[PDB]
Amino acid sequence: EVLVLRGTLEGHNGWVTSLATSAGQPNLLLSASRDKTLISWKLTGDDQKFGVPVRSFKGHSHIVQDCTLTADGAYALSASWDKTLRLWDVATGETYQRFVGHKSDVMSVDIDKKASMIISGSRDKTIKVWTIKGQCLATLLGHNDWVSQVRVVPNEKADDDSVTIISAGNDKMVKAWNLNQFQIEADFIGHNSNINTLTASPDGTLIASAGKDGEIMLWNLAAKKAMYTLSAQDEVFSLAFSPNRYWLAAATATGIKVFSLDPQYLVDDLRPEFAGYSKAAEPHAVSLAWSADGQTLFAGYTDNVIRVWQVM
Amino acid sequence: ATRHVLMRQGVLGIKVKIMRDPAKSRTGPKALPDAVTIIEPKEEEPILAPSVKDY
Amino acid sequence: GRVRTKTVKRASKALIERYYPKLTLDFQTNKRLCDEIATIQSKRLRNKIAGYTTHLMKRIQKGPVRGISFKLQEEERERKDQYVPEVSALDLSRLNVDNQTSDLVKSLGLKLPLSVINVSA
Amino acid sequence: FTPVVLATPIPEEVQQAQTEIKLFNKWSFEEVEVKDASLVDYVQVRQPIFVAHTAGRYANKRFRKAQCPIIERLTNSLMMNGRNNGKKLKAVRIIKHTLDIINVLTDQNPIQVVVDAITNTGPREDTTRVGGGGAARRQAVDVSPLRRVNQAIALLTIGAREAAFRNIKTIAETLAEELINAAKGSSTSYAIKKKDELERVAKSNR
Amino acid sequence: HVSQVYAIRQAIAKGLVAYHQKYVDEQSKNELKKAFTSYDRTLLIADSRRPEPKKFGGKGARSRFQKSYR
Amino acid sequence: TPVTLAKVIKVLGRTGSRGGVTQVRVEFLEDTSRTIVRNVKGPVRENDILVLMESEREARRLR
RNA sequence: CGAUAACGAACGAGACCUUAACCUACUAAAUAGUGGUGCUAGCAUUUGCUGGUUAUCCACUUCUUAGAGGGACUAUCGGUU
RNA sequence: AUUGCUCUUCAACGAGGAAUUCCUAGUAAGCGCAAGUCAUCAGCUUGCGUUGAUUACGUCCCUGCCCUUUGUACACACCG
Numbered sequence: 012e013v014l015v016l017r018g019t020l021e022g023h024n025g026w027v028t029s030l031a032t033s034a035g036q037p038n039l040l041l042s043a044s045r046d047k048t049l050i051s052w053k054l055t056g057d058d059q060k061f062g063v064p065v066r067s068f069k070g071h072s073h074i075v076q077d078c079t080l081t082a083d084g085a086y087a088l089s090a091s092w093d094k095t096l097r098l099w100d101v102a103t104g105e106t107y108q109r110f111v112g113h114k115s116d117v118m119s120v121d122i123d124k125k126a127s128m129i130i131s132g133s134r135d136k137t138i139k140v141w142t143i144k145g146q147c148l149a150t151l152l153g154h155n156d157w158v159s160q161v162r163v164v165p166n167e168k169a170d171d172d173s174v175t176i177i178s179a180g181n182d183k184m185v186k187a188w189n190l191n192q193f194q195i196e197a198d199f200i201g202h203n204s205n206i207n208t209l210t211a212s213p214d215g216t217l218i219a220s221a222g223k224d225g226e227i228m229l230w231n232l233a234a235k236k237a238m239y240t241l242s243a244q245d246e247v248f249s250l251a252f253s254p255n256r257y258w259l260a261a262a263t264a265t266g267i268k269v270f271s272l273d274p275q276y277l278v279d280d281l282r283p284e285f286a287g288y289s290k291a292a293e294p295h296a297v298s299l300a301w302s303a304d305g306q307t308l309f310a311g312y313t314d315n316v317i318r319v320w321q322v323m
Numbered sequence: 324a325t326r327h328v329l330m331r332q333g334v335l336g337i338k339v340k341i342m343r344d345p346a347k348s349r350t351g352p353k354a355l356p357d358a359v360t361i362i363e364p365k366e367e368e369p370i371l372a373p374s375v376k377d378y
Numbered sequence: 379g380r381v382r383t384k385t386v387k388r389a390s391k392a393l394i395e396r397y398y399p400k401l402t403l404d405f406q407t408n409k410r411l412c413d414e415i416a417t418i419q420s421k422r423l424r425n426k427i428a429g430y431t432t433h434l435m436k437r438i439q440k441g442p443v444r445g446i447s448f449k450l451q452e453e454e455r456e457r458k459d460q461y462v463p464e465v466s467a468l469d470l471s472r473l474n475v476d477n478q479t480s481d482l483v484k485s486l487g488l489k490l491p492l493s494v495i496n497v498s499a
Numbered sequence: 500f501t502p503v504v505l506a507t508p509i510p511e512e513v514q515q516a517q518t519e520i521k522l523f524n525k526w527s528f529e530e531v532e533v534k535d536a537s538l539v540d541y542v543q544v545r546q547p548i549f550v551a552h553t554a555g556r557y558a559n560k561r562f563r564k565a566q567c568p569i570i571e572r573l574t575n576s577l578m579m580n581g582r583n584n585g586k587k588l589k590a591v592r593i594i595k596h597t598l599d600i601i602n603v604l605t606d607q608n609p610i611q612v613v614v615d616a617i618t619n620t621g622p623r624e625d626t627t628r629v630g631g632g633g634a635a636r637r638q639a640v641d642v643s644p645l646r647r648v649n650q651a652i653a654l655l656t657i658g659a660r661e662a663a664f665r666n667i668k669t670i671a672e673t674l675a676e677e678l679i680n681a682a683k684g685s686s687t688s689y690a691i692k693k694k695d696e697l698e699r700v701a702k703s704n705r
Numbered sequence: 706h707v708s709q710v711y712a713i714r715q716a717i718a719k720g721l722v723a724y725h726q727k728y729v730d731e732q733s734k735n736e737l738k739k740a741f742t743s744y745d746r747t748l749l750i751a752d753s754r755r756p757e758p759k760k761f762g763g764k765g766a767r768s769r770f771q772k773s774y775r
Numbered sequence: 776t777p778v779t780l781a782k783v784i785k786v787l788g789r790t791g792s793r794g795g796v797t798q799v800r801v802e803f804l805e806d807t808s809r810t811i812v813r814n815v816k817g818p819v820r821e822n823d824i825l826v827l828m829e830s831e832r833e834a835r836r837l838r
Numbered sequence: 839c840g841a842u843a844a845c846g847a848a849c850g851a852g853a854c855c856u857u858a859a860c861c862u863a864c865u866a867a868a869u870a871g872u873g874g875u876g877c878u879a880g881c882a883u884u885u886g887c888u889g890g891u892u893a894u895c896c897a898c899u900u901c902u903u904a905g906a907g908g909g910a911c912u913a914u915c916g917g918u919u
Numbered sequence: 920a921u922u923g924c925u926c927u928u929c930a931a932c933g934a935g936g937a938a939u940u941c942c943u944a945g946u947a948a949g950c951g952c953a954a955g956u957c958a959u960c961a962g963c964u965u966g967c968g969u970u971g972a973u974u975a976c977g978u979c980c981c982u983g984c985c986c987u988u989u990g991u992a993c994a995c996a997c998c999g
């Protein structure tokens with residue numbers, strides 16, 4: 012098992028800020044970009060031009076910061092810097108519900124496992140939870156600087172109706188929230204820099220958080236205690252665990268350092284070739300995503316193309 | 324404001340210009356256009372030990 | 379001409395002195411965090427202070443820029459300055475002298491391994 | 500080529516022009532290779548246009564006019580001597596009739612006649628004004644390829660204008676004949692006559 | 706008259722590219738857009754050149770009337 | 776009859792009394808590695824091709 | 839910017855304000871405008887084309903208008919100092 | 920002869936010497952309209968649209984203005 016660059020997707024004009032896929036269609040990929048649009052892709056397997064765009068979602072006035080997809084892949088939600096959220100139909104465009112009530116940039120969105128309620132972290136230091144019809148159930152406070160990314164933990168154990176969320180902002184302190192009675196539970200102290208991202212494992216018991224310091228820092232949320240802190244040695248943007256292996260991928264400013272965690276070694280240090288751009292900087296990935304089966308690793312870079320990486 | 328005082332030699336004009344303080348305004352702009360103030364960040368010590376508070 | 383004035387160039391360097399670890403090499407994130415953390419009365423001036431602050435950061439990735447002194451930056455420059463040189467350039471493991479150096483060290487009352495060479499005019 | 504029909508009938512001769520090649524009102528932009536290697540990159544051909552009236556903005560930067568098509572620049576010099584200022588629909592009619600006349604009078608392609616005409620009437624060396632004291636002195640210097648194209652269009656159109664003035668000949672049939680006369684190169688064209696006149700004064704001053 | 710012609714061509718070019726955006730896939734949009742934008746850019750983007758206000762002291766915006774000294 | 780085509784490699788600066796004339800350093804297409812300084816009247820950038828009507832001459836400046 | 843017995847500011851320049859350009863993003867509208875559905879006219883005749891109509895009414899905001907906002911900061915890359 | 924209309928009469932002028940003005944893109948130039956003055960009267964002005972170029976992206980040659988060095992017996996300051 013080793014990674015190789017198979018192909019690249021080109022549909023955008025701004026930084027591909029987020030990727031998302033859905034387990035129901037392994038030929039699906041939803042990519043959000045800085046040109047305030049979303050593109051859905053038909054993953055055709057070919058030597059060149061692997062994957063083709065088919066649907067564009069336009070309708071956000073300023074930068075769309077991320078996207079999440081429903082499990083079946085019928086609906087998409089996109090969070091944008093125009094203080095709105097838009098729920099879209101991948102088939103017909105034609106947005107159903109527009110969520111307003113955040114007063115600043117919304118940064119991350121995540122739909123429920125049962126697709127019932129919708130969490131939203133914004134730059135107005137609040138975490139608003141919404142219906143499918145669009146009403147903000149709660150406003151979750153105590154959070155000094157602004158929220159930078161939120162996600163939901165995966166229920167893997169049978170008969171856990173419970174849903175708890177994870178939040179990371181630039182106050183160097185990440186939190187856990189039980190949304191059935193709207194409490195705060197955990198205060199994972201320990202970061203020294205602006206936390207850019209956080210990821211829950213499909214185990215639902217691990218959380219890796221990572222920021223400006225370069226410490227991809229690992230926490231066991233099953234016991235509520237720190238596990239260890241990894242080191243990527245420069246600034247990092249996104250993390251994602253593989254759905255099958257015991258693996259973690261990380262978007263450093265140099266490249267994608269991807270980590271196995273059981274013998275604790277980085278495996279490849281993949282760095283693609285760019286044919287230009289050499290003086291200033293090479294463009295760097297700002298958003299990565301695994302497949303459902305974990306076969307393909309997707310990466311959107313700052314040169315508005317999307318590079319893929321295949322296992323062997 | 325401008326006034327004409329009528330003396331016995333001729334008219335004496337009186338101009339008065341008053342610059343009010345922008346801070347005491349309470350209605351509209353509180354500062355001049357190019358006044359920029361950066362707020363001083365409150366400085367705290369690095370933690371160097373990872374911990375979880377619980378509930 | 380697009381030469382920036384004092385106000386843009388002065389507020390930005392003050393802003394970098396006290397907010398260097400927060401802000402980044404992207405104008406957009408930069409134009410958002412200044413907007414809370416400082417008071418600028420107009421949107422056009424906020425866009426030029428943030429735009430020059432983004433420009434100054436890229437200069438800071440490669441070496442020091444004159445006119446900033448925040449205690450962090452020099453200390454990190456201080457940290458990566460040893461280079462731990464293999465052997466001291468002064469030490470010869472396997473010293474040379476003129477005649478006047480030789481009678482100088484004989485005047486000092488020191489005996490030390492010396493090789494005398496004539497240094498002529 | 501298969502003709503497609505639709506609810507509004509579109510004429511068949513314009514319908515042919517859609518896929519086949521995107522050529523001019525009647526003439527093709529292929530086989531229109533400019534000969535001289537200095538004047539290439541400054542006549543802008545091989546990106547064909549349908550009509551010689553493009554509402555383009557070429558005046559912003561220093562050399563954007565070199566990307567403007569050479570048939571467009573030919574029309575632009577026609578709307579001159581004051582009474583004709585504006586009137587671009589007047590200019591592109593005249594250019595259409597001029598190109599028709601050139602094709603009827605010699606079988607060879609009209610725009611190829613126009614492109615080698617301006618290469619002939621670019622002045623290669625030209626004089627400048629050094630003072631020298633009282634009596635103004637001449638110094639021969641060399642000409643830019645952009646200036647050579649610039650001079651050529653002006654030299655061609657002034658000759659057409661002064662000859663089609665107070666005269667039964669229309670401006671279109673006048674504009675053709677100096678364009679023919681220059682493209683062969685005759686010294687009976689005004690643009691050729693002016694060109695050698697500048698070079699002799701330059702030759703006088705080396 | 707000639708302004709009306711350019712507004713017509715931009716409207717039908719944008720209308721065609723909007724139709725393929727909503728209903729047809731995005732592949733047909735990009736080949737449609739590229740052929741337009743390669744030939745002439747103002748088929749899709751409106752020209753930004755606006756009128757310049759007239760100033761007292763001259764007939765136009767730049768021109769002045771005549772200076773005479775004697 | 777001789778003319779030489781010459782590719783400009785470095786534009787030097789404006790000369791002449793009014794300023795309408797530019798010193799350029801041109802390279803000949805055939806017989807390269809021969810360099811000369813000449814005067815140009817119009818707008819010139821680099822990688823342009825002049826037609827020198829005679830190559831055995833060099834100006835430096837115009838006073 | 840740099841040199842530098844000068845450092846750090848003030849007025850003027852700049853910022854500011856008005857106006858013109860962008861917004862299928864928000865709030866809305868027979869004193870703005872489409873599309874339909876009624877009622878009709880003409881031409882065809884297939885399943886259409888172009889109009890007229892103020893009490894046909896239902897929805898709409900693209901275009902028109904002005905409130906609030908967003909957006910450009912020479913952004914990104916290359917070259918040269 | 921206020922101005923408007925009809926008919927008739929149907930002059931100079933065939934691109935203008937020495938001189939000289941304005942202008943760098945929706946700009947110059949062409950072309951009209953509204954407003955101001957207004958009982959009536961625009962060949963004027965202030966604005967607005969319509970049609971839309973050529974040339975340059977420089978320099979101190981001319982003309983002005985600014986600065987430096989310098990001399991001064993000037994300081995209502997060379998009209999001293």
Ligand SMILES: [Mg+2]
Nearest residue numbers: 663666668669
């Ligand atoms: Mg005639």
Ligand SMILES: [Mg+2]
Nearest residue numbers: 821916917918
């Ligand atoms: Mg360059």
Ligand SMILES: [Mg+2]
Nearest residue numbers: 938939981982
């Ligand atoms: Mg004169």
Ligand SMILES: [Mg+2]
Nearest residue numbers: 764948949950
């Ligand atoms: Mg006029």
Ligand SMILES: [Mg+2]
Nearest residue numbers: 989990991992
């Ligand atoms: Mg003396």
Ligand SMILES: [Mg+2]
Nearest residue numbers: 992993994996
């Ligand atoms: Mg005295």
